[PDB]
Amino acid sequence: GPPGPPGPPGPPGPPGPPGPPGP
């Protein structure tokens, strides 16, 4: 038997870093 299909995409990455201080 041949290999199965690839699994599905993994989960989304975490939130990004906080933005910078305001003006």
Add this chain to the structure above:
Amino acid sequence: PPGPPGPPGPPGPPGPPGPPGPPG
């Protein structure tokens, strides 16, 4: 007959920085 599907892939990367905060 094909084997079973592979596992889920790795997590994606972190998102981009948030926006600047408000002026002081």
Add this chain to the structure above:
Amino acid sequence: GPPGPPGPPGPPGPPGPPGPPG
């Protein structure tokens, strides 16, 4: 048959939170 390979990476996560007040 053997198992398939791992899937691709997930999408990037969302933008982080706003920075602090200036």
